[PDB]
Write a protein that binds this DNA or RNA. Sequence first.
RNA 1: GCUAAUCCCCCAUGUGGACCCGCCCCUUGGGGUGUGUCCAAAGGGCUUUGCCCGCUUCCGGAUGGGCCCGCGUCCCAUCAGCUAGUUGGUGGGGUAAUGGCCCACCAAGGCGACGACGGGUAGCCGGUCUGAGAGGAUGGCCGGCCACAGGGGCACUGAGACACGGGCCCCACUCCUCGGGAGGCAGCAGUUAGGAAUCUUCCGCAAUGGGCGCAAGCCUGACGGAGCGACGCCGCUUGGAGGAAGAAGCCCUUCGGGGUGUAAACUCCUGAACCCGGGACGAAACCCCCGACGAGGGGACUGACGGUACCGGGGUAAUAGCGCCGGCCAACUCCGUGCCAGCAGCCGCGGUAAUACGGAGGGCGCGAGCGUUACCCGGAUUCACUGGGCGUAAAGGGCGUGUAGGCGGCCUGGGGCGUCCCAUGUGAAAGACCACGGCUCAACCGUGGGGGAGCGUGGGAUACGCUCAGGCUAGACGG
RNA 2: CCGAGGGUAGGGCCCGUGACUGGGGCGGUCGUAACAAGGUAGCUGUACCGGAAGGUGCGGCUGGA
Lengths: 208, 137, 82, 99, 138, 122, 96
Amino acid sequence: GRYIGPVCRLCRREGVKLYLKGERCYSPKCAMERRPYPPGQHGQKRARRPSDYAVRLREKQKLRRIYGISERQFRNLFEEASKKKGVTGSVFLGLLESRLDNVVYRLGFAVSRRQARQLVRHGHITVNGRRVDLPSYRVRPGDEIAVAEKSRNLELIRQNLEAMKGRKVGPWLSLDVEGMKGKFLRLPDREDLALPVNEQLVIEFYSR
Amino acid sequence: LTDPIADMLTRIRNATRVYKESTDVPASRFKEEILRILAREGFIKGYERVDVDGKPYLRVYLKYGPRRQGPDPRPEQVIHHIRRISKPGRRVYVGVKEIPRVRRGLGIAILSTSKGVLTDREARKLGVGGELICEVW
Amino acid sequence: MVKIRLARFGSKHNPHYRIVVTDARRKRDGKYIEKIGYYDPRKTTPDWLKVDVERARYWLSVGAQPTDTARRLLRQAGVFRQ
Amino acid sequence: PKKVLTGVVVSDKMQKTVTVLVERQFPHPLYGKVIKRSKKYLAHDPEEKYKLGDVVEIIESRPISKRKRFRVLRLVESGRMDLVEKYLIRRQNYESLSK
Amino acid sequence: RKERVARLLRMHANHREEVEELKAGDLGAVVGLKETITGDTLVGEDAPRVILESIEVPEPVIDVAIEPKTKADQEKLSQALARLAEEDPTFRVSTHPETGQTIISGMGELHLEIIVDRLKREFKVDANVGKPQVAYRE
Amino acid sequence: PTINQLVRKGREKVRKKSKVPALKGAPFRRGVCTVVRTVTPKKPNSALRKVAKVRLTSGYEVTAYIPGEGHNLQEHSVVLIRGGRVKDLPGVRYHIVRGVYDAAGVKDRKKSRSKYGTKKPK
Amino acid sequence: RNLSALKRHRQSLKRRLRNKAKKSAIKTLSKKAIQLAQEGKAEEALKIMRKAESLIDKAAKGSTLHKNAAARRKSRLMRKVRQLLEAAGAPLIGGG
RNA sequence: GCUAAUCCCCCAUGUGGACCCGCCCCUUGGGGUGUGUCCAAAGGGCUUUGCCCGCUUCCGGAUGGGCCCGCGUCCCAUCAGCUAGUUGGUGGGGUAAUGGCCCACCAAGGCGACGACGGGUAGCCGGUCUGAGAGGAUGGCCGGCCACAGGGGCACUGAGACACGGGCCCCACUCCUCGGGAGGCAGCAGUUAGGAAUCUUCCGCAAUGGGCGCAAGCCUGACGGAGCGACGCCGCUUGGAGGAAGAAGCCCUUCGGGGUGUAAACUCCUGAACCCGGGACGAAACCCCCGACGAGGGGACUGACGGUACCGGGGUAAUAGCGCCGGCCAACUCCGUGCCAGCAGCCGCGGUAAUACGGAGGGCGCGAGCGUUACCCGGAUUCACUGGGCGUAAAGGGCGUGUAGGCGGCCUGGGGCGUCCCAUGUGAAAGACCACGGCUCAACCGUGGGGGAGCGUGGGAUACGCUCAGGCUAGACGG
RNA sequence: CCGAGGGUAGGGCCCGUGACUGGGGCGGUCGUAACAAGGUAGCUGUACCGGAAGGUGCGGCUGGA
Ligand code: SF4
Ligand SMILES: [Mg+2]
Ligand SMILES: [Mg+2]
Ligand SMILES: [Mg+2]
Ligand SMILES: [Mg+2]
Ligand SMILES: [Mg+2]
Ligand SMILES: [Mg+2]
Ligand SMILES: [Mg+2]
Ligand SMILES: [Mg+2]
Ligand SMILES: [Mg+2]
Ligand SMILES: [Mg+2]
Ligand SMILES: [Mg+2]
Ligand SMILES: [Mg+2]
Ligand SMILES: [Mg+2]
Ligand SMILES: [Mg+2]
Ligand SMILES: [Mg+2]
Ligand SMILES: [Mg+2]
Ligand SMILES: [Mg+2]
Ligand SMILES: [Mg+2]
Ligand SMILES: [Mg+2]
Ligand SMILES: [Mg+2]
Ligand SMILES: [Mg+2]
Ligand SMILES: [Mg+2]
Ligand SMILES: [Mg+2]
Ligand SMILES: [Mg+2]
Ligand SMILES: [Mg+2]
Ligand SMILES: [Mg+2]
Ligand SMILES: [Mg+2]
Ligand SMILES: [Mg+2]
Ligand SMILES: [Mg+2]
Ligand SMILES: [Mg+2]
Ligand SMILES: [Mg+2]
Ligand SMILES: [Mg+2]
Ligand SMILES: [Mg+2]
Ligand SMILES: [Mg+2]
Ligand SMILES: [Mg+2]
Ligand SMILES: [Mg+2]
Ligand SMILES: [Mg+2]
Ligand SMILES: [Mg+2]
Ligand SMILES: [Mg+2]
Ligand SMILES: [Mg+2]
Ligand SMILES: [Mg+2]
Ligand SMILES: [Mg+2]
Ligand SMILES: [Mg+2]
Ligand SMILES: [Mg+2]
Ligand SMILES: [Mg+2]
Ligand SMILES: [Mg+2]
Ligand SMILES: [Mg+2]
Ligand SMILES: [Mg+2]
Ligand SMILES: [Mg+2]
Ligand SMILES: [Mg+2]
Ligand SMILES: [Mg+2]
Ligand SMILES: [Mg+2]
Ligand SMILES: [Mg+2]
Ligand SMILES: [Mg+2]
Ligand SMILES: [Mg+2]
Ligand SMILES: [Mg+2]
Ligand SMILES: [Mg+2]
Ligand SMILES: [Mg+2]
Ligand SMILES: [Mg+2]
Ligand SMILES: [Mg+2]
Ligand SMILES: [Mg+2]
Ligand SMILES: [Mg+2]
Ligand SMILES: [Mg+2]
Ligand SMILES: [Mg+2]
Ligand SMILES: [Mg+2]
Ligand SMILES: [Mg+2]
Ligand SMILES: [Mg+2]
Ligand SMILES: [Mg+2]
Ligand SMILES: [Mg+2]
Ligand SMILES: [Mg+2]
Ligand SMILES: [Mg+2]
Ligand SMILES: [Mg+2]
Ligand SMILES: [Mg+2]
Ligand SMILES: [Mg+2]
Ligand SMILES: [Mg+2]
Ligand SMILES: [Mg+2]
Ligand SMILES: [Mg+2]
Ligand SMILES: [Mg+2]
Ligand SMILES: [Mg+2]
Ligand SMILES: [Mg+2]
Ligand SMILES: [Mg+2]
Ligand SMILES: [Mg+2]
Ligand SMILES: [Mg+2]
Ligand SMILES: [Mg+2]
């Protein structure tokens, strides 16, 4: 299945804070805030100038690990974006963003994709009325992604919806808080999202 | 002599790298038509029908860029490159759809066709094809 | 003799017939002569049936023979209405 | 259509039959240049009115014998023995190429 | 490995009866098994993967040397004394540490001299027999 | 070469030569051990490499390397082999596959146990 | 270990008899007429070749002969008889 | 020895057809015309002065074939000559039909360096895999064509076969009980053998399709489904949030410390599995009445998968492994060993302090998989058309002469073969591509769209190549 | 008449194998031919000779002076 392991060690190796926990990521108990160096016996040792391959690898695992997705599913997607028309980098990022378990997370139904995933899987998510429990559904523009009207009586969803009141969401999004509905308006433009990934380098990685 | 056309392109090629003012190639109406294009696209200043010991030739007045500053002042070339495609040993015959795009348009391709001796930009608009004579840029 | 027949396509538990004209002794899913319509028995799309009325008329006239359940689809699309 | 070919009689040494040598040209599938391939057809001459050197035309026809499937359509040019020479010399050149 | 039991058989005096089941504490034969050799354990395809006590106690108490003479049917000897070491588990095919010639270890003289002809009349092996050579010293 | 030359003669296609003929193009082949012993490798190495002589079902009789630390292969041992030569032993062009037939896996191997046929311990 | 193909077989043999016998008659009568046509016997030839022609066609009614074979069978017959009769005329009565 | 018919034959009728000969159109044996001759046929069913189902001859249709022709189709030239039914002719046999298919005779030809003959290997294509493309490789599954039905020969019946589950004969093998008989799983399952390796002696004719039948219906291992196998692709799970400047253990340590590590514990939340309930789409035709057995309208029967999917209620935190960590190449330290044991794809590593062996800790990579072996394409621009070379790196023939061949100066004209242009026919379906849509997604699957290269046909253009014609003197030859 | 094939006889091609044998590739004995004018410039086609590399004749090459 998913990576399903110790998630702080990931950030530490990447040297960038990947937001994989929600609440704790903002705490000063965040591993990154206390120990911004790679996991393992050799964390505090002077770095060796990473090779060109070394760069593209790590720049890819970043983007990969963020969305919490298998190298397989990730690769098909990338490859899908290459067959696709126009800009490979953006379209890849777009299709990545278009994943159900991600959209759910973008609308604050959950604090982590990990959590969001479980929400989709365990059923508590719907799409245009009817339930959808597959954490991979390419959400297309125009979709109403609410909470299960049969599962709205759950604190975890409530509290996470309780907080999502005023937050300015994706331009590609709209959020009916309280009523627990959500809409998917558009697919992202390049600028619309800022994440610590030089998308061009991932392309260069598979271009090997 | 076997290929006059190549020779012509070559008399030109040799002439430019030594920066000759002019250069003569023996005359043929087909060589004319190609030289016609060379001037009209600004690869040369033009040509003129001459005579050496009663033999019809064609003086080609070469064209170059400005003098240059630095350790080597030899001007940039106008005809950077010129080579035969179609040859007596192996003829090249593109149709319209397959006429190449020489150097992203920065250069030209010459082709002899049923409507005359045209360029790639030229034969395309007229929607034809023929013998891919040579390529220049 | 030349027939009007359903040639199964689709997949396992996803039937999707092509109403078709072919020789009787031909394999059910083999090379047919012409396609004159399709048929989705599950009815999972709005138009789960479409018959080229004009062409079915041509073949029907020359000796083409519909199957029992072939003409039902054909009758339903009114190839026999006066 | 009934295929029609143009070739030369290189043998009239049969009864009511002549051998028509037909040349064809085409670009090489990978190296482009035009190359000459040829072939010999046995043509039906029911009158024996065609002789060596006759540049003639032969038309696709119903079988006359084994490998006779062409009748002579018409004459185009007579006495082209020079072509006979070319075909004939090479055939004689083969005598050296033995072991 | 997983094995398909197909039919079930009972051997009588003058006929074999096909049966549907063999309850515990009962015996019979089974068709469809291919990898199962004697001394193995079969469990239901979702059953506790246990293994019965094998067997294992008697030790071969006669040993005789066999040499493939002249010479190259020692490889034709090997795949055919393999068809038998798993089916008649009694006899051993041992090669001596020092001066190692093959020592077909039998449970008896007759258990070897009826295995003697299996190799000679059924596996043919151009060989002649005798005794094992000694691991001497100086 | 001139283009006309190319039309006449053309380019010779390159044919590959199987580095493992005895397999009969199979992924693996079974065989019996006629001889099991040690052979010393060539310069600049020095050792006593464990190897086995094997008569394959393919008719061939080859010599095959035995990987890992320690083994149990003797004469008449039925053994499975795979491709891959040992650089230091000329004539050896195949490896015995550990943990198949009368070949045991390496006792007490913890790392990389699949290439040596050892089962995962508790 | 059984079928109705043997039935098909039993039938095949029975048909073979009818077919053979018919074809026999045809060959016998044909050559016979042709022979008379060569000696001519102009009358008796044509007199015979008619019962030949008939039996040729009568067989073609069934599976014995194909139409376009009997057509051939009849063609060659008459051409043979007539060409023969050309040596020593007097072709009477009627047939062709 | 008896006997019926839709079994066989004879006579009649002759729209018509078939054959010979003559004429007419046409042009290979196409279509008329007349004289002569030859040829048809079957009955059964009911509601019964009439329809149904069959029969016969002819013509046209439609679909399915036969045969023929152009071009395309692997390796070896250390295979260079091959051929007497051989090549053509005339006559005849034969066939649905051409043909040396076969036969008699006559002629002496036919093929081959543009590779005959011989040897090796191979079912061919749609496509598939790879590749920037050109190319290379490949034809499993599905679709089209071919070939075969233990090894061979033969013909019979038939619209169709020289017939897998039809017949005859020879062979080999097996098998039943002294004359003879039997068998043909390259059908569906299954056994056995071989092998590194490949499945259930399943369910159902409910669907679609096939043969027969007026119909009811019967048959159908086609087929629709089920089983086994990570073999492949796709989807999903083994949890989610919180949780110490951070327990125990283990590893490292300069003995200060560092690492595993928010990882675990523990807190709360969710709820794969399982439990109960409901429960399919695929199935409306054939059939019945009305109408007329038509058109049209109504009505009834039918589910192998399967009480399966799916929907609802309840509901337990609930599998992780494999490779690698000298360089290529991402991931480093301790101990053990000491050219031993061992690693290895290449360079190479191991000889006492090894990031290269073996364990450990840690780490990197993928994740119900990870690795390995074999093979194919790639990188190999390392057979170089795209797109390489040959003074010294491998490579100019020892030198001439010349055959075939490839190639060829200037001007004008004819033809239009290449070449180019447009139109049109073909380029099946599946696949590929783009678009939407159906299974909750995806794989899978459906519906539309785009069609190209190639060849057929029609028209068009004439610069270059071709060819034909006429002139020139700069090449070349001569005085 | 032809005809599966059976038989007789004589050829051709390819595969496997064979006492013995030729050199080849890979892992101590004798000399020192080549690389420095390698201590006789070297290489060379050929010829004869010698345990062995080699020597020498005739001509050739410079990749020697
Ligand atoms: S807490 Fe800080 S370190 Fe741990 S995962 Fe969230 S962000 Fe990365
Ligand atoms: Mg793209
Ligand atoms: Mg790539
Ligand atoms: Mg199912
Ligand atoms: Mg003839
Ligand atoms: Mg064994
Ligand atoms: Mg070493
Ligand atoms: Mg053993
Ligand atoms: Mg008779
Ligand atoms: Mg018949
Ligand atoms: Mg008939
Ligand atoms: Mg009666
Ligand atoms: Mg009667
Ligand atoms: Mg009559
Ligand atoms: Mg003859
Ligand atoms: Mg004839
Ligand atoms: Mg013949
Ligand atoms: Mg003839
Ligand atoms: Mg040829
Ligand atoms: Mg073969
Ligand atoms: Mg084959
Ligand atoms: Mg196929
Ligand atoms: Mg056969
Ligand atoms: Mg068989
Ligand atoms: Mg047989
Ligand atoms: Mg049959
Ligand atoms: Mg048969
Ligand atoms: Mg057949
Ligand atoms: Mg059978
Ligand atoms: Mg049987
Ligand atoms: Mg079977
Ligand atoms: Mg199956
Ligand atoms: Mg059925
Ligand atoms: Mg049915
Ligand atoms: Mg059944
Ligand atoms: Mg099936
Ligand atoms: Mg599975
Ligand atoms: Mg998967
Ligand atoms: Mg601390
Ligand atoms: Mg600790
Ligand atoms: Mg600590
Ligand atoms: Mg946790
Ligand atoms: Mg719940
Ligand atoms: Mg609960
Ligand atoms: Mg239903
Ligand atoms: Mg009524
Ligand atoms: Mg239930
Ligand atoms: Mg539920
Ligand atoms: Mg837990
Ligand atoms: Mg790896
Ligand atoms: Mg790598
Ligand atoms: Mg590294
Ligand atoms: Mg290792
Ligand atoms: Mg050291
Ligand atoms: Mg050490
Ligand atoms: Mg190590
Ligand atoms: Mg290593
Ligand atoms: Mg390769
Ligand atoms: Mg290549
Ligand atoms: Mg390339
Ligand atoms: Mg080139
Ligand atoms: Mg050289
Ligand atoms: Mg020279
Ligand atoms: Mg010449
Ligand atoms: Mg010219
Ligand atoms: Mg020329
Ligand atoms: Mg033209
Ligand atoms: Mg298509
Ligand atoms: Mg969709
Ligand atoms: Mg389509
Ligand atoms: Mg002239
Ligand atoms: Mg014979
Ligand atoms: Mg014989
Ligand atoms: Mg016999
Ligand atoms: Mg020999
Ligand atoms: Mg030897
Ligand atoms: Mg010397
Ligand atoms: Mg010396
Ligand atoms: Mg010397
Ligand atoms: Mg010297
Ligand atoms: Mg020297
Ligand atoms: Mg000398
Ligand atoms: Mg001596
Ligand atoms: Mg001497
Ligand atoms: Mg000298």
